[PDB]
Amino acid sequence: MHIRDMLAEAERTGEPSFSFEYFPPKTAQGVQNLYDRMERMYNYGPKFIDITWGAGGRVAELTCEMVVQAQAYLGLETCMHLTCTDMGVERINDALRKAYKAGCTNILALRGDPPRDKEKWEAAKDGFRYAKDLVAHIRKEYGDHFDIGVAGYPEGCDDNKDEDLLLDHLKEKVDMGAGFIVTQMFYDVDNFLRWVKKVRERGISVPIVPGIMPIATYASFLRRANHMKCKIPEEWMAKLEPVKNDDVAVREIGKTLVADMCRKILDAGIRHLHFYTMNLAQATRMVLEELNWLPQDWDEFPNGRWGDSRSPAFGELDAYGVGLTGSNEQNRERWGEPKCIRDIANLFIRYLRKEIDYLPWSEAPVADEADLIKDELIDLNRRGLITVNSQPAVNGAKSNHPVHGWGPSNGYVYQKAYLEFFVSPELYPEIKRRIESHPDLTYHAVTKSGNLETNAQSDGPNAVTWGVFPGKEIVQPTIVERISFLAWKDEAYHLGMEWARCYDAGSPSRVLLEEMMNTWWLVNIVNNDFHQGNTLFEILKGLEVTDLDKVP
Amino acid sequence: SNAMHIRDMLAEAERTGEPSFSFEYFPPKTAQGVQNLYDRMERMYNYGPKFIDITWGAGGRVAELTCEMVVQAQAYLGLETCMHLTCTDMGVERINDALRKAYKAGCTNILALRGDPPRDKEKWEAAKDGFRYAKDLVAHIRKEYGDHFDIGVAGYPEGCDDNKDEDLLLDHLKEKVDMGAGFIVTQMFYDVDNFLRWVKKVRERGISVPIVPGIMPIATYASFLRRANHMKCKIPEEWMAKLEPVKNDDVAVREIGKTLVADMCRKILDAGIRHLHFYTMNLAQATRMVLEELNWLPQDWDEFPNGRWGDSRSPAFGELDAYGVGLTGSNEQNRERWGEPKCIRDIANLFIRYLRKEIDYLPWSEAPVADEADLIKDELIDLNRRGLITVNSQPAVNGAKSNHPVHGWGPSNGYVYQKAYLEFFVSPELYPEIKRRIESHPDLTYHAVTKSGNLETNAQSDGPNAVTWGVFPGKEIVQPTIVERISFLAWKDEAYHLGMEWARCYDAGSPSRVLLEEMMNTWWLVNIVNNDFHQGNTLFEILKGLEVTDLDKVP
Amino acid sequence: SNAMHIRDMLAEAERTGEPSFSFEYFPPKTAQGVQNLYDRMERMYNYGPKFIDITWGAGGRVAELTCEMVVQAQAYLGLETCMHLTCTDMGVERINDALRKAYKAGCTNILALRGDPPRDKEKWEAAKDGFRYAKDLVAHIRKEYGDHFDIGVAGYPEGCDDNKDEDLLLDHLKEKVDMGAGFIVTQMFYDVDNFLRWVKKVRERGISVPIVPGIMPIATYASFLRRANHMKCKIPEEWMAKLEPVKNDDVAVREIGKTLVADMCRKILDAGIRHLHFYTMNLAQATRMVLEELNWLPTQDWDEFPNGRWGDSRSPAFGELDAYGVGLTGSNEQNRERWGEPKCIRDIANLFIRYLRKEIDYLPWSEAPVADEADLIKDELIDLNRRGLITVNSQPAVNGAKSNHPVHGWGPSNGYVYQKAYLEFFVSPELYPEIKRRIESHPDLTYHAVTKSGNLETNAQSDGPNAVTWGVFPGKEIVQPTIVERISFLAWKDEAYHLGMEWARCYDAGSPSRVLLEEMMNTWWLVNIVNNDFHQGNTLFEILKGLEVTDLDKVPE
Numbered sequence A: 001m002h003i004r005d006m007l008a009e010a011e012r013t014g015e016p017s018f019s020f021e022y023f024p025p026k027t028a029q030g031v032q033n034l035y036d037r038m039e040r041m042y043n044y045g046p047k048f049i050d051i052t053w054g055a056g057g058r059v060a061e062l063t064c065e066m067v068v069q070a071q072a073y074l075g076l077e078t079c080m081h082l083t084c085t086d087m088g089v090e091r092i093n094d095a096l097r098k099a100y101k102a103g104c105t106n107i108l109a110l111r112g113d114p115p116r117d118k119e120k121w122e123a124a125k126d127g128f129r130y131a132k133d134l135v136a137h138i139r140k141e142y143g144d145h146f147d148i149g150v151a152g153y154p155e156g157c158d159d160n161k162d163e164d165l166l167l168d169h170l171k172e173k174v175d176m177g178a179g180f181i182v183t184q185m186f187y188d189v190d191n192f193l194r195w196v197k198k199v200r201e202r203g204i205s206v207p208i209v210p211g212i213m214p215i216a217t218y219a220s221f222l223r224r225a226n227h228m229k230c231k232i233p234e235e236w237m238a239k240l241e242p243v244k245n246d247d248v249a250v251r252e253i254g255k256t257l258v259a260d261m262c263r264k265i266l267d268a269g270i271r272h273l274h275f276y277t278m279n280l281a282q283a284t285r286m287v288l289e290e291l292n293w294l295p296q297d298w299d300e301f302p303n304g305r306w307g308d309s310r311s312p313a314f315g316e317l318d319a320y321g322v323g324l325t326g327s328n329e330q331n332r333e334r335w336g337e338p339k340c341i342r343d344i345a346n347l348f349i350r351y352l353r354k355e356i357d358y359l360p361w362s363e364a365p366v367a368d369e370a371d372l373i374k375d376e377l378i379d380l381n382r383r384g385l386i387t388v389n390s391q392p393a394v395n396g397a398k399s400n401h402p403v404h405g406w407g408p409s410n411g412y413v414y415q416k417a418y419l420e421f422f423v424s425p426e427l428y429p430e431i432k433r434r435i436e437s438h439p440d441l442t443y444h445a446v447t448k449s450g451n452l453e454t455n456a457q458s459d460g461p462n463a464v465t466w467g468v469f470p471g472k473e474i475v476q477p478t479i480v481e482r483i484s485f486l487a488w489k490d491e492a493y494h495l496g497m498e499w500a501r502c503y504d505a506g507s508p509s510r511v512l513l514e515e516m517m518n519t520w521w522l523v524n525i526v527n528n529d530f531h532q533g534n535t536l537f538e539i540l541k542g543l544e545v546t547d548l549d550k551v552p
Numbered sequence B: 001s002n003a004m005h006i007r008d009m010l011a012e013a014e015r016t017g018e019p020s021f022s023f024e025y026f027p028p029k030t031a032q033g034v035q036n037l038y039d040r041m042e043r044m045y046n047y048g049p050k051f052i053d054i055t056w057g058a059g060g061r062v063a064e065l066t067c068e069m070v071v072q073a074q075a076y077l078g079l080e081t082c083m084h085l086t087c088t089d090m091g092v093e094r095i096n097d098a099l100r101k102a103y104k105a106g107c108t109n110i111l112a113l114r115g116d117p118p119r120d121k122e123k124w125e126a127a128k129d130g131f132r133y134a135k136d137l138v139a140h141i142r143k144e145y146g147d148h149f150d151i152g153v154a155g156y157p158e159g160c161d162d163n164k165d166e167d168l169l170l171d172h173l174k175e176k177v178d179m180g181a182g183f184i185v186t187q188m189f190y191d192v193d194n195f196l197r198w199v200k201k202v203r204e205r206g207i208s209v210p211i212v213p214g215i216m217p218i219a220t221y222a223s224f225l226r227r228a229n230h231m232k233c234k235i236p237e238e239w240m241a242k243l244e245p246v247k248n249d250d251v252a253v254r255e256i257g258k259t260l261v262a263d264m265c266r267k268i269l270d271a272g273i274r275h276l277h278f279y280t281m282n283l284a285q286a287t288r289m290v291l292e293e294l295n296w297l298p299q300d301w302d303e304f305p306n307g308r309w310g311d312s313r314s315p316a317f318g319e320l321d322a323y324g325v326g327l328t329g330s331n332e333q334n335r336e337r338w339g340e341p342k343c344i345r346d347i348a349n350l351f352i353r354y355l356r357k358e359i360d361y362l363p364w365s366e367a368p369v370a371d372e373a374d375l376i377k378d379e380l381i382d383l384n385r386r387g388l389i390t391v392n393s394q395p396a397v398n399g400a401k402s403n404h405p406v407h408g409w410g411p412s413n414g415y416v417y418q419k420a421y422l423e424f425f426v427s428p429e430l431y432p433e434i435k436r437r438i439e440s441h442p443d444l445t446y447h448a449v450t451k452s453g454n455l456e457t458n459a460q461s462d463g464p465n466a467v468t469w470g471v472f473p474g475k476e477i478v479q480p481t482i483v484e485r486i487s488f489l490a491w492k493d494e495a496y497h498l499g500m501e502w503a504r505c506y507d508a509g510s511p512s513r514v515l516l517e518e519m520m521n522t523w524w525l526v527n528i529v530n531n532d533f534h535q536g537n538t539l540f541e542i543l544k545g546l547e548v549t550d551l552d553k554v555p
Numbered sequence C: 001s002n003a004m005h006i007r008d009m010l011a012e013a014e015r016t017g018e019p020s021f022s023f024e025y026f027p028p029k030t031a032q033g034v035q036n037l038y039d040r041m042e043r044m045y046n047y048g049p050k051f052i053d054i055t056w057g058a059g060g061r062v063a064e065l066t067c068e069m070v071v072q073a074q075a076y077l078g079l080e081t082c083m084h085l086t087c088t089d090m091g092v093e094r095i096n097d098a099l100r101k102a103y104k105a106g107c108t109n110i111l112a113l114r115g116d117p118p119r120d121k122e123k124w125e126a127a128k129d130g131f132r133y134a135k136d137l138v139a140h141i142r143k144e145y146g147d148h149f150d151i152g153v154a155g156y157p158e159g160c161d162d163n164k165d166e167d168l169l170l171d172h173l174k175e176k177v178d179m180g181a182g183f184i185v186t187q188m189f190y191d192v193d194n195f196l197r198w199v200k201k202v203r204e205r206g207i208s209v210p211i212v213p214g215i216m217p218i219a220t221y222a223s224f225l226r227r228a229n230h231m232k233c234k235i236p237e238e239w240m241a242k243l244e245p246v247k248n249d250d251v252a253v254r255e256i257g258k259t260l261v262a263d264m265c266r267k268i269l270d271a272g273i274r275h276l277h278f279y280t281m282n283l284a285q286a287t288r289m290v291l292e293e294l295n296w297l298p299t300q301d302w303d304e305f306p307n308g309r310w311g312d313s314r315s316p317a318f319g320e321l322d323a324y325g326v327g328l329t330g331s332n333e334q335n336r337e338r339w340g341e342p343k344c345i346r347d348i349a350n351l352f353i354r355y356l357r358k359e360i361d362y363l364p365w366s367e368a369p370v371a372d373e374a375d376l377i378k379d380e381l382i383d384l385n386r387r388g389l390i391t392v393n394s395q396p397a398v399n400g401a402k403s404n405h406p407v408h409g410w411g412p413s414n415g416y417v418y419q420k421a422y423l424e425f426f427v428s429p430e431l432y433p434e435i436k437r438r439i440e441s442h443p444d445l446t447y448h449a450v451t452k453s454g455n456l457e458t459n460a461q462s463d464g465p466n467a468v469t470w471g472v473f474p475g476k477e478i479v480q481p482t483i484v485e486r487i488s489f490l491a492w493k494d495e496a497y498h499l500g501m502e503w504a505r506c507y508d509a510g511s512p513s514r515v516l517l518e519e520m521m522n523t524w525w526l527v528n529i530v531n532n533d534f535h536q537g538n539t540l541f542e543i544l545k546g547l548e549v550t551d552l553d554k555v556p557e
């Protein structure tokens, strides 16, 4: 009923004590599948489950829906996460009332991320600048009804804090009435155990709950670590390097790595483990088997926004909710102050030339599979077709191919060429006309506020990467599909706006980026003939956005 | 249930002209198939059938499963069921057991059938028990259960039964109806004119009970042809002509077939025959489509099965004709077409005759040899000459265009792929060597087993292995052909059974029988897949210089 | 529950003279012990106690368990509970948390206690929080809960909480009572004349609240003596005399003790003190027996005879249980006075040898003075300690001594008793690997070894219980009072390393003595070795011959 009590019992008995965190899926089908997965995984015997809070809102209704479904109908003990600065007092109160009626008695009280547009920062005027304010609020309005957790950071935090100040701030939050701490994910257990010592020496006595993230896939492992700024031991990276492109092998090794880390934590007397499942069952199950703590695999291996959208695990899962990293100042420092289209284009070309690691829409630095199409990509961007994502055609590379290879060995892998880009409304009609004339191309196109255009008649899923491996069915990690694409549309236009808001209200940069997002089309083109490398670039060869140097 | 008798339901269909139809299902070959079938039966019940039929497995191997399903359908899912039941295949205790189960389930409708007599005849219990013909089962049900069960019997518009003699057939049909059958269900047909003429003949013979036409929707071109040819069932040239342009694309075939069958159904309805009985083959889509076309309406992952090569999780899995039975013709007819083999070489020559297109069917053959065997014909022949008796095969294909005249399938502007595979019988003496050779080549997956022994394989996980797939515009990868443990074991049992049923076409002491029985009791069935689909020949290379000894030895 | 206050229950006892008694239980050390305790509490409630007490674990850790048990007892089993609670050991948040839990459980009676102050008073949060004495907790409960809880406080007839100056003690008792306590519960005693004189003193000081005598039935001779000596508690010479003929047979001891304690109780009842509070030590039998003797009544004897940390860990009664407080007794000053100021390993070794030579009565890890069964192995024990293998506990092999043997005998007569030799000691991490290597070479030895913060090493594959003392008696199953078992050993590990640290903290923050003792506890292994061949006396000492800890005279930096 209260987590602090469950934790106290874990600390006394040393019994198997663990919990699972889930996030709100991006698809309706994902939500239904998640409920099934939550039911199955509850038989592993977690003391409770966490449901994350979507930064801002929109999915507020979904989080509350799911807490109600889990707590009230499925009879799963839930801890609801809740942010404050990204919202207002009415939305906070609404969430608390819903959690109350649902039978939830555990809140993880969080700040969330401050708005970039500080002119429109209601929560701070409302007295919700920090997580401590939410802890205080819950205690004042609901007394002892809710047990309250707070976030702890063994390896520091995004905002500009030395460790001493961070622990002072942690003590403030705990002293407002939080019964436990939940840490951000980590893979350096020595640093974690040192941090625990520091926390106790600061006079913070509440139970500490380590955030454990099992390794489902090499990509999500790295991307989530780098995003959370999270040292991976050289021992681990070394052990994974031989098999990084085979996620079955990665997961097998990671099982042992993470389970060993968990044993070091348990032997240190920290007895409750909090698993970030990423809405997947297998990696968590595997770690629990390794710990001897135990009493449907079709979406085992997600691929960011390119996997099956029916999976609970679908989407780019680097952070707790939508947006760019870094201070407004830092983002102006990395991406400059663009006054026109050409400036944006040059930024993107810098990305393609490996001079910048991250664009606003970039999960990661430019991949090696761009090397042989780099000039064509650069050419598009010069002409103002701002490329967001791409892949080359591949016609049966060996699965150990250093650039193109993935999965187990003695396989062959295939890729349909695709291209995804922003383009001006002036130029879109022509692009449409040209694609429609070539019937072996599938396209999806949409504006921020408009309707989806496509030539796909059925518009079911289209496989654009697949693999043939001994003794196996065809593996299809990369899909282009209507629902996946619309899910991305919303995020992409949002990221553009969050970029715009790194600049001042009247600024050239802001008005430029906002006009772009409100008028430009996001376009995805797939060439279903995977024998052909260049036909997408050929189709787009004459086309240029005019007024590349125009300043608003 | 509720004392509902089909004869009354049919009388009402004939009076009202209301939408009146029923769906036949068969017992699936896999446990997963069974579960999936229950879901499908639930979904399809919303189309509004008056009832559903569940078929009886020839012999009563799957008798427990049929009964399980009738109970599940009638008693738990609340679906009005007619249970099929055979008699000559079984004996009195098994018949009574099935009837008692159908009784307790709340079933009130039986389709009373003979099934196929045993080939041996020395071991024919049912005839000893007085169950030689379906009429005997009709009489039995009436004696033991009175009016509780309404009883259907089989009718044959295009001859069938055991002999097409004609007229004698209608006399025999009248005998069975007069034993106390309330209705007739016909075997499938596609010649509606012949059907309507047959109906006239049936009535003129003084048989007045309601006639229910067996309608088979076209799910796939292959199953359409194979089931028609097996049932000896005239397909109009009109139909064959209209399907030929698109025979290798089953989406297109099914679209055309919707119209063909719906048109046929309209001709039947206009003739005053008002209840349609659909053979679903445990698939929903083709039946749904025909009903949409008639305006009779109020999980497509397995829409396109591929005999024993499709997904074994599908209800529709398996090679689906003649109710699970075995081999088709008279013992005489089978001796006439397959000869009287005295040794291994005789069998080999029979198989080579098959490969050379000189005979259309082997005991293990769904169909005549495909064109995709033409470019590997010599190697197949070579194996059979050396006594590696090939049952099934396919060549490697590395991205043929989907319109390729031999290799192509599915829609256009696609590419299709095949892993080479080989399936064959081999002597126990030679199997150890074959095993040793396969194990040395790690890119080969193999499955091997005897009639009575355990499955050997190098597949560690032994999940499904895709051996035919296709890449089509705007689609996920299509995988019609799978080699999988469950599929293979399902086949093992059937293959060794077919061999024994072949043996029993010959006399008890005969050279042919003792030969075939020794072979089935000792030889291994082996399936080898070359996962490198860039390579055509490595399977044949691996098996070069292996020969079964004593090819001419007569037992 | 039901607003029932103990002061009213006591007033009724005093008016009616009805059978009025209560049972104290403590939080068990084992999960299995907890479950067994619930069963015992259920059974014993049929004896008809007015309520039960649940003790508070000094410091915490088991705070959760105390609260769990109060909830289980009060809320689910329907047993009227009085929850004990300390304050100086804790802080304001933990106190409030405990009170809130007792509140929600339906408890309406608290025994308000100080507990023991930290030895390192630099780290004393509770005193900054305004919780220096029990009176502060009494005041706090009254302020936060008003009349909801009736509050008891501790009384000391024989002068044993911190100081013994009886005048000052009674002044302080009056302060506590006047803060809003409704009753007094005394520490255990066996001198009834002193008790009745004390009551007179209490009343003459102007303290009128009901007094509840703490009665401890005699379960075993060992626990009787150890608890008495530890609480500094005069046992009458009449009692010692009457027990001496049969001290090694606990059945006989318990039979005699039934009469002794029941007679004492009758003297108390005739004096007009009508409610008896029994310290059960989580055992049923001795309390039952006293109640039968008083005519106050209206297998599960498998653990009737515990043996400190050596008995079955599944018993509720398992563990040492000399005090409430999981630490060493006495002022920091007093402890420095008796154990000196050790600067190096040799100093500690000499302290231990002084213990072995009967020159000091108590080491930090010592329940009692050295036993007579050490006499014939004393030189070998001394030899180990000289070499820096600091021995904590030991026993000789015994191969079927008669049960009346003056040194080795125990239990009833015409029996035979057996002991596996065992040795338990602290050893440096430098030397442990060698000891391990040597034990592993001798397969008839079972060992358990562990550090303060490290994992358990052992050669026991199943690692179930190993019997190291047993007895064969006429008409009986084999009696197995002494067991070495994983759970028992880990329970002890934690306590042993804690006692070492509590010793360290008797010295100043920077001091040689403290840094020495802390380094030792944080780095040295606790090792238990059993020689399963009980025909062999000396093979443990042989195995460990020529091992020596280096830097015995080195003084830390």
Ligand SMILES: Cc1cc2nc3c(=O)[nH]c(=O)nc-3n(C[C@H](O)[C@H](O)[C@H](O)COP(=O)(O)OP(=O)(O)OC[C@H]3O[C@@H](n4cnc5c(N)ncnc54)[C@H](O)[C@@H]3O)c2cc1C
Residues within 6 Å of the ligand: A051, A052, A053, A054, A055, A056, A081, A082, A083, A108, A109, A110, A111, A112, A113, A129, A130, A131, A132, A151, A152, A157, A158, A159, A160, A161, A165, A166, A169, A172, A173, A182, A183, A184, A185, A211, A320, A321
């Ligand atoms: C286990 C866990 C779960 C999470 N779940 C979610 C989730 O569901 N949804 C989501 O959007 N995010 C989530 N987050 C992310 C979190 O919202 C971000 O890290 C966010 O930036 C703030 O974290 P916080 O609540 O710890 O903020 P705070 O504890 O307020 O700290 C925020 C910053 O302000 C500083 N600070 C604190 N007090 C003061 C003060 N008095 N004066 C000045 N500066 C101060 C801190 O040092 C720090 O730099 C989660 C994080 C963790 C570790």
Ligand SMILES: Cc1cc2nc3c(=O)[nH]c(=O)nc-3n(C[C@H](O)[C@H](O)[C@H](O)COP(=O)(O)OP(=O)(O)OC[C@H]3O[C@@H](n4cnc5c(N)ncnc54)[C@H](O)[C@@H]3O)c2cc1C
Residues within 6 Å of the ligand: B054, B055, B056, B057, B058, B059, B084, B085, B086, B111, B112, B113, B114, B115, B116, B132, B133, B134, B135, B154, B155, B160, B161, B162, B163, B168, B169, B172, B175, B176, B185, B186, B187, B188, B214, B322, B323
């Ligand atoms: C709608 C339908 C459903 C079927 N369902 C199944 C099923 O679920 N399971 C299964 O195993 N099979 C099934 N069958 C197949 C059937 O069992 C075979 O066709 C079988 O070989 C004949 O069975 P019958 O009941 O039609 O035979 P019968 O009507 O007994 O005819 C059998 C043969 O004996 C002849 N004959 C009949 N009476 C006499 C007589 N008095 N004297 C001499 N000769 C006689 C007939 O002319 C014919 O040649 C079904 C057939 C149909 C049409």
Ligand SMILES: Cc1cc2nc3c(=O)[nH]c(=O)nc-3n(C[C@H](O)[C@H](O)[C@H](O)COP(=O)(O)OP(=O)(O)OC[C@H]3O[C@@H](n4cnc5c(N)ncnc54)[C@H](O)[C@@H]3O)c2cc1C
Residues within 6 Å of the ligand: C054, C055, C056, C057, C058, C059, C084, C085, C086, C111, C112, C113, C114, C115, C116, C117, C132, C133, C134, C135, C154, C155, C156, C160, C161, C162, C163, C168, C169, C172, C175, C176, C185, C186, C187, C214, C324, C325
């Ligand atoms: C019946 C009983 C039950 C107990 N139960 C438990 C239990 O469950 N758990 C546990 O940990 N311990 C328990 N104890 C032990 C108790 O916690 C210790 O004996 C403790 O050291 C003193 O407890 P107290 O409440 O009497 O302290 P207090 O009455 O506060 O006094 C303790 C010492 O401080 C002195 N003192 C008091 N007031 C002042 C003042 N104003 N100025 C100066 N000195 C002062 C006293 O004279 C005495 O020397 C129990 C004791 C008894 C008698």
Ligand SMILES: C[S@@+](CC[C@H](N)C(=O)[O-])C[C@H]1O[C@@H](n2cnc3c(N)ncnc32)[C@H](O)[C@@H]1O
Residues within 6 Å of the ligand: A217, A245, A246, A247, A248, A249, A301, A302, A303, A304, A367, A369, A403, A404, A405, A406, A407, A408, A465, A475, A477, A478
């Ligand atoms: C497409 S590969 C990336 C390889 C390379 N960067 C390229 O050129 O595409 C990444 C995807 O493959 C998936 N994957 C890797 N190994 C797999 C395996 N054994 N089975 C299934 N999916 C696998 C991952 O989970 C991820 O979704």
Ligand SMILES: C[S@@+](CC[C@H](N)C(=O)[O-])C[C@H]1O[C@@H](n2cnc3c(N)ncnc32)[C@H](O)[C@@H]1O
Residues within 6 Å of the ligand: A303, A306, A348, A351, A359, A362, A365, A366, A367, A368, A369, A370, A377, A387, A388, A389, A390, A391, A415, A465, A477, A478
């Ligand atoms: C996650 S991978 C997609 C590959 C695909 N999922 C697969 O299975 O191979 C992202 C790809 O887009 C490319 N990319 C990233 N940012 C880009 C940009 N701004 N413009 C064009 N291509 C970009 C990367 O170099 C990489 O090839």
Ligand SMILES: C[S@@+](CC[C@H](N)C(=O)[O-])C[C@H]1O[C@@H](n2cnc3c(N)ncnc32)[C@H](O)[C@@H]1O
Residues within 6 Å of the ligand: B220, B222, B248, B249, B250, B251, B304, B305, B306, B307, B310, B370, B371, B372, B406, B407, B408, B409, B410, B411, B468, B478, B480, B481
């Ligand atoms: C593998 S192809 C035939 C191979 C080879 N050309 C031959 O005929 O010997 C036949 C299989 O493909 C399936 N099939 C045909 N068209 C299809 C389509 N459009 N979508 C999915 N499966 C299809 C059929 O149902 C059957 O399972």
Ligand SMILES: C[S@@+](CC[C@H](N)C(=O)[O-])C[C@H]1O[C@@H](n2cnc3c(N)ncnc32)[C@H](O)[C@@H]1O
Residues within 6 Å of the ligand: B306, B307, B309, B351, B354, B362, B365, B366, B368, B369, B370, B371, B372, B373, B380, B390, B391, B392, B393, B394, B468, B480, B481
């Ligand atoms: C139903 S198809 C199976 C292949 C599958 N439909 C596909 O995806 O191509 C049967 C195949 O086995 C071959 N075959 C049939 N009988 C054979 C035999 N006795 N020996 C060897 N090959 C045989 C046919 O020529 C054909 O290629």
Ligand SMILES: C[S@@+](CC[C@H](N)C(=O)[O-])C[C@H]1O[C@@H](n2cnc3c(N)ncnc32)[C@H](O)[C@@H]1O
Residues within 6 Å of the ligand: C307, C308, C310, C352, C355, C363, C366, C367, C369, C370, C371, C372, C373, C374, C381, C391, C392, C393, C394, C395, C469, C482
């Ligand atoms: C708890 S008593 C008795 C243990 C056990 N119940 C028995 O039957 O002997 C512990 C035993 O170890 C001895 N002992 C106590 N402290 C010791 C120490 N520091 N070093 C060695 N032996 C010690 C005692 O003299 C006694 O023989």
Ligand SMILES: C[S@@+](CC[C@H](N)C(=O)[O-])C[C@H]1O[C@@H](n2cnc3c(N)ncnc32)[C@H](O)[C@@H]1O
Residues within 6 Å of the ligand: C220, C222, C248, C249, C250, C251, C305, C306, C307, C308, C371, C406, C407, C408, C409, C410, C411, C412, C469, C479, C481, C482
């Ligand atoms: C291990 S023996 C040692 C006694 C004494 N040091 C001696 O040997 O002279 C003491 C323990 O034996 C057990 N004990 C004594 N008498 C017993 C009896 N009659 N039945 C069962 N256990 C008994 C109790 O658990 C007691 O703590």
Ligand code: NA
Residues within 6 Å of the ligand: A007, A008, A010, A011, A207, A208, A269, A270, A271, A272
């Ligand atoms: Na904990």
